[PDB]
PDB file of C-alpha atoms and ligand atoms in Angstrom:
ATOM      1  CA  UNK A   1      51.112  81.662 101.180  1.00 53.63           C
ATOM      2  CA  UNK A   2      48.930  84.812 100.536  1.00 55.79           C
ATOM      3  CA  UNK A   3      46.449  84.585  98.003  1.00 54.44           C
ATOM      4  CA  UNK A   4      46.074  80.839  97.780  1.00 55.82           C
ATOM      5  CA  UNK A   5      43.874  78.098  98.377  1.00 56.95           C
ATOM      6  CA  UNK A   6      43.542  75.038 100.511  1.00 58.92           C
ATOM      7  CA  UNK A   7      45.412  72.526  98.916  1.00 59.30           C
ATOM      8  CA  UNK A   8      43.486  69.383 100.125  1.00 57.51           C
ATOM      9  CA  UNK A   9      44.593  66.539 102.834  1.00 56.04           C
ATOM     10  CA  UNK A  10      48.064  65.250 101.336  1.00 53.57           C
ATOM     11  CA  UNK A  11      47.187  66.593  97.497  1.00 53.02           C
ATOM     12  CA  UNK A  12      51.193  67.974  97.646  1.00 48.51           C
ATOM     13  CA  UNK A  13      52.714  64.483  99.361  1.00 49.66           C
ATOM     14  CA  UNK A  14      56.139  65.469  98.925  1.00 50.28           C
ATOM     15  CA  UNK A  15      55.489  68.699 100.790  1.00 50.26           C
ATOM     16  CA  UNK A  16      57.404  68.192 104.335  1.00 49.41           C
ATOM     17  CA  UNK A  17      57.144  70.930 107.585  1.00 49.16           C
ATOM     18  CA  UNK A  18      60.358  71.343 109.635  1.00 50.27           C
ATOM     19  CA  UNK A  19      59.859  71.392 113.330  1.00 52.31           C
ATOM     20  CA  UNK A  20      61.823  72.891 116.412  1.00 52.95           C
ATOM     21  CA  UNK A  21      58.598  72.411 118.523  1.00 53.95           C
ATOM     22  CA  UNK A  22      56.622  74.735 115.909  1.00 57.27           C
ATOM     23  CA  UNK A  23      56.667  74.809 112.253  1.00 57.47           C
ATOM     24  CA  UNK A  24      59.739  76.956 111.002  1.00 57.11           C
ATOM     25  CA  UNK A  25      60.416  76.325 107.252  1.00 57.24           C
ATOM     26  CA  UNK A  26      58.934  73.853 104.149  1.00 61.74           C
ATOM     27  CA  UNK A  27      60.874  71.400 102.133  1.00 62.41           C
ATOM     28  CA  UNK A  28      60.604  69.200  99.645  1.00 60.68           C
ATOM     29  CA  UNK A  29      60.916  64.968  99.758  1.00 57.04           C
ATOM     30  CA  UNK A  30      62.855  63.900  96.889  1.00 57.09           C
ATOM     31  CA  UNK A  31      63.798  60.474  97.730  1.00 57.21           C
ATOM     32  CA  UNK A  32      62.722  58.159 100.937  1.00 53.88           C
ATOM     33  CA  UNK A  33      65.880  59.872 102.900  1.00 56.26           C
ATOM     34  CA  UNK A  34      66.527  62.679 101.493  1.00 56.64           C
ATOM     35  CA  UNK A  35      64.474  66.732 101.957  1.00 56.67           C
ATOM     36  CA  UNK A  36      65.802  69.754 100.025  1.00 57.40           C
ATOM     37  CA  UNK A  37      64.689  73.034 101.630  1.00 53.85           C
ATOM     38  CA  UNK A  38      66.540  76.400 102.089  1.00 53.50           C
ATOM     39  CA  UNK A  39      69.855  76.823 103.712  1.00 54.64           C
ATOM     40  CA  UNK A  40      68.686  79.632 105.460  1.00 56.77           C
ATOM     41  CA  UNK A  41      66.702  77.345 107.447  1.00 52.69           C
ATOM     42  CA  UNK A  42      69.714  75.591 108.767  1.00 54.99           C
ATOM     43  CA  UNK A  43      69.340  75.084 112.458  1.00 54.60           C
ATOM     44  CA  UNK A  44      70.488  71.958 115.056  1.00 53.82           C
ATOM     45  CA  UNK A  45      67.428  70.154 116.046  1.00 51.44           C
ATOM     46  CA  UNK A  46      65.038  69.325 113.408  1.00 50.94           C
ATOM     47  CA  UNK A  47      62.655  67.275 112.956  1.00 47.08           C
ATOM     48  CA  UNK A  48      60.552  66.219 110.178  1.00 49.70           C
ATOM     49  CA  UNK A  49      57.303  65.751 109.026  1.00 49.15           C
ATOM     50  CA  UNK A  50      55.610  64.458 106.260  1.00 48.30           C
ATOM     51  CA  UNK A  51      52.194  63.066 105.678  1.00 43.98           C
ATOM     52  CA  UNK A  52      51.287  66.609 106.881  1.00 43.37           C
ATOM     53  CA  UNK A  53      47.903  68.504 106.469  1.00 44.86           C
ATOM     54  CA  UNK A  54      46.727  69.964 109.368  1.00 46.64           C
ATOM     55  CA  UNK A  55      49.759  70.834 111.735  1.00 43.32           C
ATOM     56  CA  UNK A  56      48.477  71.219 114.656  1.00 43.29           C
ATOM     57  CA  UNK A  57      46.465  68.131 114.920  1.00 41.13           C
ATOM     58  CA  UNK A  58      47.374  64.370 114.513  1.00 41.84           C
ATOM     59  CA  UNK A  59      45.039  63.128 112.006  1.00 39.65           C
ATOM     60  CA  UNK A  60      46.826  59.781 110.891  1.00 39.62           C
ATOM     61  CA  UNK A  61      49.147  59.328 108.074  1.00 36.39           C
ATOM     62  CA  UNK A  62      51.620  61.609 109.676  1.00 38.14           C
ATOM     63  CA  UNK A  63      55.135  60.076 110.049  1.00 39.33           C
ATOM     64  CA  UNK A  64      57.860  62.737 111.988  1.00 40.42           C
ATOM     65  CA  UNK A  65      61.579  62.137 111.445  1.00 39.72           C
ATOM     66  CA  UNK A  66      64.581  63.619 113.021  1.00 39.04           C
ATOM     67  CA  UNK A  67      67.030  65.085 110.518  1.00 42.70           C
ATOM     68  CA  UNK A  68      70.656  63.459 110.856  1.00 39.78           C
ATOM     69  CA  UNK A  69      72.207  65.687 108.571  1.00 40.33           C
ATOM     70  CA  UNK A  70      72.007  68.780 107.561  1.00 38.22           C
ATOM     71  CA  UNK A  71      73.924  70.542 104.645  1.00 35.04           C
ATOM     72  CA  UNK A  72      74.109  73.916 103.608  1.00 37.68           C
ATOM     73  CA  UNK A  73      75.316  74.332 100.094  1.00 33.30           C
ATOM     74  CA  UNK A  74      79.237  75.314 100.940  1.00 32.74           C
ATOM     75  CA  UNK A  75      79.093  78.747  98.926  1.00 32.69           C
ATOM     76  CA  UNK A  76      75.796  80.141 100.921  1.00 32.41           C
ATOM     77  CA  UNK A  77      75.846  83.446 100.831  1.00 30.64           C
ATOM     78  CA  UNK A  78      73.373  85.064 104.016  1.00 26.92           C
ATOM     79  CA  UNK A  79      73.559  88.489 102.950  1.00 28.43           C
ATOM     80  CA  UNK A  80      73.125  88.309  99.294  1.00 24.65           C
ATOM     81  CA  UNK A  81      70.900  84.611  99.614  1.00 28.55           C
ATOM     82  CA  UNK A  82      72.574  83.408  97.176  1.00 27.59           C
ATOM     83  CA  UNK A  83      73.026  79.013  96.842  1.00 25.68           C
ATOM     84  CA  UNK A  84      70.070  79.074  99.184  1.00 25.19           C
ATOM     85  CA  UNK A  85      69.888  75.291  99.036  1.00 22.09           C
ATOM     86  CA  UNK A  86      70.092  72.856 102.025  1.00 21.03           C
ATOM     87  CA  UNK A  87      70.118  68.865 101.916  1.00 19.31           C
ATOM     88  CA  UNK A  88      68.383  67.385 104.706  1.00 19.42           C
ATOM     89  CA  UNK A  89      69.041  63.290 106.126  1.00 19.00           C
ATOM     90  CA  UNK A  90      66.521  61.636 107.482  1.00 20.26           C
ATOM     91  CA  UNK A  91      67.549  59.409 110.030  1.00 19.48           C
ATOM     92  CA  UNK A  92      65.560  56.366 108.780  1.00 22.03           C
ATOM     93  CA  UNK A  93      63.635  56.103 105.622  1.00 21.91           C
ATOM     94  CA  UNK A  94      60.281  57.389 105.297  1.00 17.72           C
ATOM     95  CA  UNK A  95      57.470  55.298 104.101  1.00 20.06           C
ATOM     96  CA  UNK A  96      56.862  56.157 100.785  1.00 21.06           C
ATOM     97  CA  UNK A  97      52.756  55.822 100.118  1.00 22.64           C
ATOM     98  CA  UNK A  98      49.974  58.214  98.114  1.00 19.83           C
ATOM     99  CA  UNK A  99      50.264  60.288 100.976  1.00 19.17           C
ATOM    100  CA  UNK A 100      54.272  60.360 101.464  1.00 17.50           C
ATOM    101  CA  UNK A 101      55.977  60.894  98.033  1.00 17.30           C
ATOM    102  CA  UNK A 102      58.959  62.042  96.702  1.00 16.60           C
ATOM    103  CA  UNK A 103      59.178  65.250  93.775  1.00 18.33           C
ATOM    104  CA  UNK A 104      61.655  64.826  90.774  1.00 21.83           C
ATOM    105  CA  UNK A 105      64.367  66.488  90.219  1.00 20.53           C
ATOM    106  CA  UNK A 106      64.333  68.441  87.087  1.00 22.61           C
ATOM    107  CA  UNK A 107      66.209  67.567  83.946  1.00 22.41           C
ATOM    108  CA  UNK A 108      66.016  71.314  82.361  1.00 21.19           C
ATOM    109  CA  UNK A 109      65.323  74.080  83.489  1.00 20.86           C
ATOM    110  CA  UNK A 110      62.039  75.719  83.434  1.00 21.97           C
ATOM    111  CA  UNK A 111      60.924  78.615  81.247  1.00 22.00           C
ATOM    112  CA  UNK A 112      59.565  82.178  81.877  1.00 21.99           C
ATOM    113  CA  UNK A 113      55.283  81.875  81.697  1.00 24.05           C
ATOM    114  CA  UNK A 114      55.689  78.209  82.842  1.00 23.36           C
ATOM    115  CA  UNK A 115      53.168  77.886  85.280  1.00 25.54           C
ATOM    116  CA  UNK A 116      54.258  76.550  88.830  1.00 24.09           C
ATOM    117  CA  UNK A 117      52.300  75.036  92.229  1.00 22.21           C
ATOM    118  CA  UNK A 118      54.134  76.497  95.188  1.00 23.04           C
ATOM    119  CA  UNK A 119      52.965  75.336  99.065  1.00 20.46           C
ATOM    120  CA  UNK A 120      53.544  75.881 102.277  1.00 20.64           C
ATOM    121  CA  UNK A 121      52.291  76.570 105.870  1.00 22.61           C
ATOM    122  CA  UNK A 122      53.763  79.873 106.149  1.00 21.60           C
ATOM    123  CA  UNK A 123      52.062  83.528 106.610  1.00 16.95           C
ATOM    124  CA  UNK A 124      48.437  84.013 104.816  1.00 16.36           C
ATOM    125  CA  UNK A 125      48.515  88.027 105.017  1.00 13.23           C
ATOM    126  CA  UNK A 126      50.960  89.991 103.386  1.00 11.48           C
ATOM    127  CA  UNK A 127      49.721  92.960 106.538  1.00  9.06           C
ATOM    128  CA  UNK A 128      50.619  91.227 109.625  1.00 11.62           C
ATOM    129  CA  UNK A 129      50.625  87.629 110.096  1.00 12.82           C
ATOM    130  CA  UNK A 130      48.189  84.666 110.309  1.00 12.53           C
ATOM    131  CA  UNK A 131      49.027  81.067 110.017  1.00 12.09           C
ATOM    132  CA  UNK A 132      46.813  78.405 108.971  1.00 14.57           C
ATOM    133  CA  UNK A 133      46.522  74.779 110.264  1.00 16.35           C
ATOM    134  CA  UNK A 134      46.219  73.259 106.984  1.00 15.61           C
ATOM    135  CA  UNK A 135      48.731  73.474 103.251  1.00 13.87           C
ATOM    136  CA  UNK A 136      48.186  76.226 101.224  1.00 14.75           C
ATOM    137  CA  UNK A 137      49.116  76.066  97.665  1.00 16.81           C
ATOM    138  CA  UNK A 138      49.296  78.737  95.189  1.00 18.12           C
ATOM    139  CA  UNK A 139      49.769  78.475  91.073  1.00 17.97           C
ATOM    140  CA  UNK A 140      51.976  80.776  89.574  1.00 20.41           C
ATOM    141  CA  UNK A 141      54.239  81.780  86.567  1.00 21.31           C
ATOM    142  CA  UNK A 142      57.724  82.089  86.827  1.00 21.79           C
ATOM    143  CA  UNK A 143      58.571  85.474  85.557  1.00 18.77           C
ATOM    144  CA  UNK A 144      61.155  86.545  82.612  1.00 16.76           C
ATOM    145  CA  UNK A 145      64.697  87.262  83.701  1.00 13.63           C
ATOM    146  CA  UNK A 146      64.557  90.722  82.737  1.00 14.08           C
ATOM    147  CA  UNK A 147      61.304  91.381  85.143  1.00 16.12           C
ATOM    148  CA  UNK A 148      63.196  89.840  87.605  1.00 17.33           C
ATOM    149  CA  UNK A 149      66.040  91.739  87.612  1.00 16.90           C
ATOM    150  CA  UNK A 150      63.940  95.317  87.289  1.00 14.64           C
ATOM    151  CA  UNK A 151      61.635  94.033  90.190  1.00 15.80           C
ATOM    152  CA  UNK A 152      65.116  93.543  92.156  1.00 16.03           C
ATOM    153  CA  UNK A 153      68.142  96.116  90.897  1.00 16.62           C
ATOM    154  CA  UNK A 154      71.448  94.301  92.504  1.00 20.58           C
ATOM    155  CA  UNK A 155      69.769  91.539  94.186  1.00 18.12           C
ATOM    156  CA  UNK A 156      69.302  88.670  91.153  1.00 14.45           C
ATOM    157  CA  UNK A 157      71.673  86.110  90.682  1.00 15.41           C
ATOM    158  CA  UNK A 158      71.957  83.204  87.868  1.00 11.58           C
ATOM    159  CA  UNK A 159      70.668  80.558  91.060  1.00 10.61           C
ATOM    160  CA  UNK A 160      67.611  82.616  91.259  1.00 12.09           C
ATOM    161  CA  UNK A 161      64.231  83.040  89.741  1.00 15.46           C
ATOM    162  CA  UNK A 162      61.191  85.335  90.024  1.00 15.48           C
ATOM    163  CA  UNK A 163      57.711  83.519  90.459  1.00 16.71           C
ATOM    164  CA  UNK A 164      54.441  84.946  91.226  1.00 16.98           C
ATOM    165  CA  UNK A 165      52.264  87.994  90.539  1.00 16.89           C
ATOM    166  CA  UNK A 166      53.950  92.228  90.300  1.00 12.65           C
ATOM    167  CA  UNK A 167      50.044  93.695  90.880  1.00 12.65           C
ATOM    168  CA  UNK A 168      50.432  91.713  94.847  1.00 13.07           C
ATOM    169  CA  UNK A 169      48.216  89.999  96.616  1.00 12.94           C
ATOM    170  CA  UNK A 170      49.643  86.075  95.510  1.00 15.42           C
ATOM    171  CA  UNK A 171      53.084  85.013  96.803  1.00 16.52           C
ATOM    172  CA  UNK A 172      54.432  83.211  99.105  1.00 18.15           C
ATOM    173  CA  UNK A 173      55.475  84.400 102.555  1.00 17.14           C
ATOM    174  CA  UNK A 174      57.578  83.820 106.016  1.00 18.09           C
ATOM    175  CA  UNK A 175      56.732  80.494 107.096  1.00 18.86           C
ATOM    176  CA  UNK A 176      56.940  78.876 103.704  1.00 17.62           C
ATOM    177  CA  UNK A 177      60.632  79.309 103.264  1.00 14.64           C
ATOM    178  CA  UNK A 178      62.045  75.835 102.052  1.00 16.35           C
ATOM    179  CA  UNK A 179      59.008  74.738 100.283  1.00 16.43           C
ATOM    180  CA  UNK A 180      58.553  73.479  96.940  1.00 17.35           C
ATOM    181  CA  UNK A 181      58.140  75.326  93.653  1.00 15.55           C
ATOM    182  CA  UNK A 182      56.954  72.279  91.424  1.00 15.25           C
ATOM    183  CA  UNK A 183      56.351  72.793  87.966  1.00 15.56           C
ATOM    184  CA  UNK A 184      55.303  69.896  85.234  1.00 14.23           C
ATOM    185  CA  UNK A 185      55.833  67.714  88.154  1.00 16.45           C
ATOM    186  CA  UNK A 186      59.640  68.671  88.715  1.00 18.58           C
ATOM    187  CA  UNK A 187      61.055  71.069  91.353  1.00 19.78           C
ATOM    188  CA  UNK A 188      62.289  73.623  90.140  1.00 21.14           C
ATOM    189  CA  UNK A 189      62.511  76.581  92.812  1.00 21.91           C
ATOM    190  CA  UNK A 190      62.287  76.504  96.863  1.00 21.18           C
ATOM    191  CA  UNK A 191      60.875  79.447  98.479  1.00 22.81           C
ATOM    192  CA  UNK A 192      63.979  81.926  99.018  1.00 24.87           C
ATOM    193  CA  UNK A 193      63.035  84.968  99.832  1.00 24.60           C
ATOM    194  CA  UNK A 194      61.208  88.578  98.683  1.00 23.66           C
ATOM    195  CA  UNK A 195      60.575  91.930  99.706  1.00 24.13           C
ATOM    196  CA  UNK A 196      57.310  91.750 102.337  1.00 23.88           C
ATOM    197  CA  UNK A 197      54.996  89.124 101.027  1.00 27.06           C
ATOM    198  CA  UNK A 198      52.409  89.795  97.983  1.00 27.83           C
ATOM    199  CA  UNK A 199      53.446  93.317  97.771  1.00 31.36           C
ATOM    200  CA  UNK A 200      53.060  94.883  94.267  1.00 29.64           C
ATOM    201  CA  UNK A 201      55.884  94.822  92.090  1.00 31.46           C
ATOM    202  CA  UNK A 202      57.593  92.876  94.728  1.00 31.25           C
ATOM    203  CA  UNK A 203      57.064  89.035  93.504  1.00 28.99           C
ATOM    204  CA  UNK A 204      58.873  86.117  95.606  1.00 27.78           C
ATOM    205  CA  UNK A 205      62.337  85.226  94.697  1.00 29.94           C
ATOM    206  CA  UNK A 206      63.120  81.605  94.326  1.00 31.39           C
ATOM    207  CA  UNK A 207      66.609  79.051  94.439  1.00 27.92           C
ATOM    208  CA  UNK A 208      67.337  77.812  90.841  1.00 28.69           C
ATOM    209  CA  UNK A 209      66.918  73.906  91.754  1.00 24.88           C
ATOM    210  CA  UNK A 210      68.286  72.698  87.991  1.00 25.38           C
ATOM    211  CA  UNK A 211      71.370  74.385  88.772  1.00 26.21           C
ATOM    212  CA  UNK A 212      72.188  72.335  91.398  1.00 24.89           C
ATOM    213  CA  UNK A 213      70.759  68.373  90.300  1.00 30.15           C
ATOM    214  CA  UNK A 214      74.675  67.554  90.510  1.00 30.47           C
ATOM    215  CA  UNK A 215      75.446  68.638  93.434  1.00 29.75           C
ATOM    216  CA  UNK A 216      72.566  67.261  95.009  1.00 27.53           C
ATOM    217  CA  UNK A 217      73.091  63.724  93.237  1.00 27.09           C
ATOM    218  CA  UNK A 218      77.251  64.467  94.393  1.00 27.47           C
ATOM    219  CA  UNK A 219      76.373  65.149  97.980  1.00 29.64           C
ATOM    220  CA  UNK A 220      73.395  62.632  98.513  1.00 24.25           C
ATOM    221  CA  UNK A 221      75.979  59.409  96.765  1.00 23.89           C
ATOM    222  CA  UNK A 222      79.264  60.597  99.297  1.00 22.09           C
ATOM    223  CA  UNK A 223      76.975  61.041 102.649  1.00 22.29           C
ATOM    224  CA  UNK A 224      76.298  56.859 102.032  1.00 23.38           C
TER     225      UNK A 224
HETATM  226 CA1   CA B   1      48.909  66.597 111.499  1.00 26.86          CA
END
């Protein structure tokens, strides 16, 4: 997150980190076995951890994971990052406390000028990289459709959205791919992708989570 603030110790409880042996991408808890995050953060290997604040230090209320599924959304598309949606397993349930918490799915979609809180471990500099120990979090709007689509000739799809600021310095950034973009207490985008990080006229591009509340509810009731 460039631009942001320090959330607080466990103020976003449903934010996860996804670990190789280093933080990779975000995700979001939405039930006690169950993490949505980006497909293009598919890999073999991961583990999970919520209760996170600082990342690099145990500090108690941690609670790590391993994933024992992970599912790409079947029509994926890496070029074009389109369906940029991944399910993740856990392999036993996470406690579920004030700390460890699970996000709602939304019900609508959300509208353009709806302010959103978006969070994540990921890049703090949109000029060469820093990571911080602790969650960032960042508020912003999600943009109209036509701003997206000038900000992004070709590259706009129906599953995505435009969130953020076009005069730079606020977005979201490498590192917090996966993470949550939680408006009125529903998730409604994960961070996708963008052009650089916080660069004018450049805001971050997001997945469309209301277009896919069936196929997650689908997926999560066959993988029983
Ligand atoms: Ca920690």
């Amino acid at each position: 997150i460039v631009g942001g603030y320090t959330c607080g110790a466990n103020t976003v409880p449903y934010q996860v980190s996804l670990n190789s042996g280093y933080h990779f991408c975000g995700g979001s808890l939405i039930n006690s076995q169950w993490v949505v995050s980006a497909a293009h953060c598919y890999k073999s290997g991961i583990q999970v951890r919520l209760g996170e604040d600082n990342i690099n230090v145990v500090e108690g209320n941690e609670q790590f994971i391993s994933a024992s599924k992970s599912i790409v959304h079947p029509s994926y598309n890496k070029r074009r990052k389109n369906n940029d949606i991944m399910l993740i397993k856990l392999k036993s349930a996470a406690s579920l406390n004030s700390r460890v918490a699970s996000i709602s799915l939304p019900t609508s979609c959300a509208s353009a000028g709806t302010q959103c809180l978006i969070s994540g471990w990921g890049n703090t500099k949109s000029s060469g990289t820093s990571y911080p120990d602790v969650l960032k979090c960042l508020k912003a709007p999600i943009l109209s459709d036509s701003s997206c689509k000038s900000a992004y000739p070709g590259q706009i799809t129906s599953n995505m959205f435009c969130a953020g600021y076009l005069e730079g310095g606020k977005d979201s950034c490498q590192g917090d791919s996966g993470g949550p973009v939680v408006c009125s207490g529903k998730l409604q985008g994960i961070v996708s992708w963008g052009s650089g990080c916080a660069q004018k006229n450049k805001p971050g591009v997001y997945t469309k989570v209301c277009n896919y509340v069936s196929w997650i509810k689908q997926t999560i009731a066959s993988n029983h």
